[PDB]
């Protein structure tokens, strides 16, 4: 069964934070083996706390876990630069127990104030559907933290296929620049009244919208 | 001090397959099952399968089942995890990782599932302060430049990171913002530069023709 973490959190230096990991009463709720990995950009991950709430030797005890019911929660107080990461909460693997991770969260250590994204939805080109394709083209830029969700709709309905979006990445400014690309046929584009690229940026969702026709 | 070292590297066309090695030192190889999770890129950790090092028995994760295999060899401390028919989505850093708590875990080992060759792009004007734009498409491998008017408009230009689509291309966008005042009068052209196919293209953005 599929462990639930935040997509991202975030706190200021100094500050404590914590991550919450929920699964159900079966897993998370009967055994004392959920586990917490550290893992910095193009690094392997470091367990920082396992069964529950004990360290290995040498992890800061600014480290600590608990569990209530069917969730676990990893805490890190006095937030160091070094803290910014992400994290992922897991369960023992191995005899008996088949092993299963969280979707992971990113922490960030909060060094500017936060920022939305500036979103821009293009339509397919004239020239491009003329080649007989479609590429519909959201650009998000300037946010922080560096953590969105990126959802499409046809009309109201949401669509995954035909979806390529990138992880954010650091801008010159150190906000963050992202971008979803939706490929559909030409005849998708002309038969629905409309495509939506949907933002969610801490909790705040925007939505473009463009259609084939003025009317 | 425990180390787990992994193979390198590889590229795999789709239908292939992978082995990946991780060797144990600095504790006793047997003491520990060797955990096995894979990660596609800027996706998140996922558990494939574990193996006890003493008898070599083995559990797989229900999603690889049928095509991943994992072996051991004591006699040289190693661990091995063979995953077959790879598809493009199996592209991840694959890793091992110490005992039943994973604490440690091997560097692990990059592998990009590809038949992707060198190929120039497409490019398209993305129409019209306002936002105008080139979208360049399906090109591989990277880097795409892009310039405005041969170097001439530097202020507003955004030339965003490329996606690394699923069909093992990369597409960009690159994005201006100018006084919605002069889209009338000024041109605009992008000058997109694909070194590694040997092409350049140069494309007009023109604005959305009111009616």
């Known amino acids: 069964s599929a462990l639930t973490q935040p997509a991202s959190v975030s706190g200021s230096p100094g500050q404590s934070i914590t991550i919450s990991c929920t699964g159900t009463?079966?897993?998370?709720?009967?055994?004392?083996?959920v586990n917490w990995y550290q893992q910095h950009p193009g690094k392997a991950p470091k367990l920082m706390i396992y069964?529950?709430?004990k360290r290995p030797s040498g992890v800061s005890n600014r480290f600590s876990g608990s569990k209530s019911g069917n969730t676990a929660s990893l805490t890190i107080s006095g937030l160091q630069a070094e803290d910014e990461a992400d994290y992922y909460c897991?369960?023992?693997?191995?005899?008996?127990?088949?092993?299963?991770f969280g979707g992971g969260t990113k922490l960030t250590v909060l060094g500017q104030p936060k920022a939305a994204p500036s979103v821009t939805l293009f339509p397919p080109s004239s020239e491009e559907l003329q080649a007989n394709k479609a590429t519909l083209v959201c650009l998000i830029s300037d946010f922080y933290p560096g953590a969105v969700t990126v959802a499409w709709k046809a009309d109201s309905s949401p669509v995954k296929a035909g979806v390529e979006t990138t992880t954010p990445s650091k801008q010159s400014n150190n906000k963050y620049a992202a971008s979803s690309y939706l490929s559909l046929t030409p005849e998708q584009w002309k038969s629905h009244r409309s495509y939506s690229c949907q933002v969610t940026h801490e909790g705040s969702t925007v939505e473009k919208t463009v259609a084939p026709t003025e009317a | 001090q425990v180390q787990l070292v992994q193979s390198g590297a590889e590229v795999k066309k789709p239908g292939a397959s992978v082995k990946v090695s991780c060797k144990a030192s600095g504790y006793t190889f047997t003491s520990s099952y060797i955990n096995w999770v894979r990660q596609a890129p800027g996706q998140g950790l996922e558990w494939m399968g574990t193996?006890?090092?003493?008898?070599?028995?083995?559990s797989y994760a229900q999603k690889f089942q049928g095509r991943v295999t994992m072996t051991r060899d004591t006699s040289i401390s190693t661990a091995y995890m063979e995953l077959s028919r790879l598809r493009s989505d199996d592209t991840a850093v694959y890793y091992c990782?110490?005992?039943?708590?994973?604490?440690?875990w091997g560097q692990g080992t990059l592998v990009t599932v590809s038949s992707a060759s060198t190929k120039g792009p497409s490019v398209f004007p993305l129409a019209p302060t306002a936002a105008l734009g080139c979208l360049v498409k399906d090109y591989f491998p990277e880097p795409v430049t892009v310039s405005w008017n041969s170097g001439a408009l530097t202020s507003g230009v955004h030339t965003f990171p490329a996606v690394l689509q699923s069909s093992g291309l990369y597409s960009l966008s690159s994005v201006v913002t100018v006084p919605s005042s002069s889209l009338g009068t000024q041109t605009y052209i992008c000058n997109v530069n694909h070194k590694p196919s040997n092409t350049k293209v140069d494309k007009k953005v023109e604005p959305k023709s009111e009616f």
């Open positions: 193996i006890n090092p003493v008898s070599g028995s083995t």
């Open positions: 897991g369960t023992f693997a191995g005899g008996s127990y088949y092993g299963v």
């Open positions: 990782a110490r005992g039943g708590w994973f604490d440690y």
């Open positions: 009463s079966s897993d998370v709720g009967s055994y004392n083996y």
């Open positions: 069964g529950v709430s």
